[model samples]
Target: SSDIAFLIDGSGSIIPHDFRRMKEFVSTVMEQLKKSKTLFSLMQYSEEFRIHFTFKEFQNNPNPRSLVKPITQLLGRTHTATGIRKVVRELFNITNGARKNAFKILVVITDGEKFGDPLGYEDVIPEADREGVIRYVIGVGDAFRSEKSRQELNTIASKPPRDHVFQVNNFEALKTIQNQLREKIFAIEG
Candidate 1:
């Protein structure tokens, strides 16, 4: 079984509206990926990391009403690097222990800004790679793209060309972005 971890930012910069967008985006992504029985975990970040849910089994129930409560439960402060390290050290580690060949992925949905100990990721990330973990970063913001941030994300993600690094300037298209991510994962066969 492949393991997927979502490192979500709950920093104060994310307005209530954006938080709603984030929830909806995650819901859509989860529902879509459920079609293939992808196991995932939810890691929310602020000054620290909180795994509201761990690498549990996920499958779509297709009941929107049923999903609303769980979706609304997510809240955070946006500690990007800590959350990534948490995924690297904890969630993926747990999943890896069970299935050595699991296709491990860390999907970070953040605004591409780190509020705490950003440089700390370098140490944990190398260990993650050594343990066969892959990361994909999605940056969403309207500000001028920072080469430094992109470069950092590039080093974090397992794939090249930084294609796994996605950027969206608005929330209106989040559903589409979620779908696009799902398609990318869905297309993988083996």
Candidate 2:
């Protein structure tokens, strides 16, 4: 089985409408990956974090939007690195329904660089690597246009950046990468 965890941003920087688009994107990706032997978990974070569902929760209610659609934003500042670390600590473990033999995959979606995150990427990403967590980051908005913004996205990704990094100009554009993302996950499934 494949364990796919999504870390989504619910920062004050994104309007509610934009936030909805991101949630919808999560749903679409779940729809794309549901047919396979996969387990899904999503955590929405800003300065705070909310575990929308865990792998065990997903096994019961696989139509994720029922859980996803009602998720409003945390409306706080960004603390992405902490959020990413939590996904590994909380969701990707047997305590949260992660299977011992399953593949660990993390997909982080954010608008920009982390803010006020004491645990930087260096502190957390190496742990993910050591634990065999394959990561992919999706940058949404003009934030990634800057070198500093992309550096965070670049480092969290797996060795072959092309297969692990995705950038969309805006939240609405996230749909464009759905198939490509599913394709990459399926590639790893093999």
Which has the greatest lDDT? 2
Per-residue alpha-carbon lDDT of candidate 2 for residues 1-190, written as tens digits (9 for 90 to 100): 8889999998898988888889898988988788566889999899899999999898878777787888878888899889978998999989888889889999999986788887888888888998789999999999898877787788889888877999999988999999999999889886
TM-scores for the candidates: 0.81, 0.96
| lDDT tens per residue, model 1, 38-145 | 566777777766675655433323332244336532344455666777787778755533246677777787764665565566767777778776677777775317
Candidate 2 pairs with clashing backbones: none
lDDT of each: 0.65, 0.88
Root-mean-square deviation (CA) per prediction: 3.4, 1.1
Tell me how far the alpha carbon of residue 119 in candidate 2 is from the true structure, in angstroms, after superposition.
1.0
Q: Which regions of candidate 2 deviate over 4 angstroms?
A: none
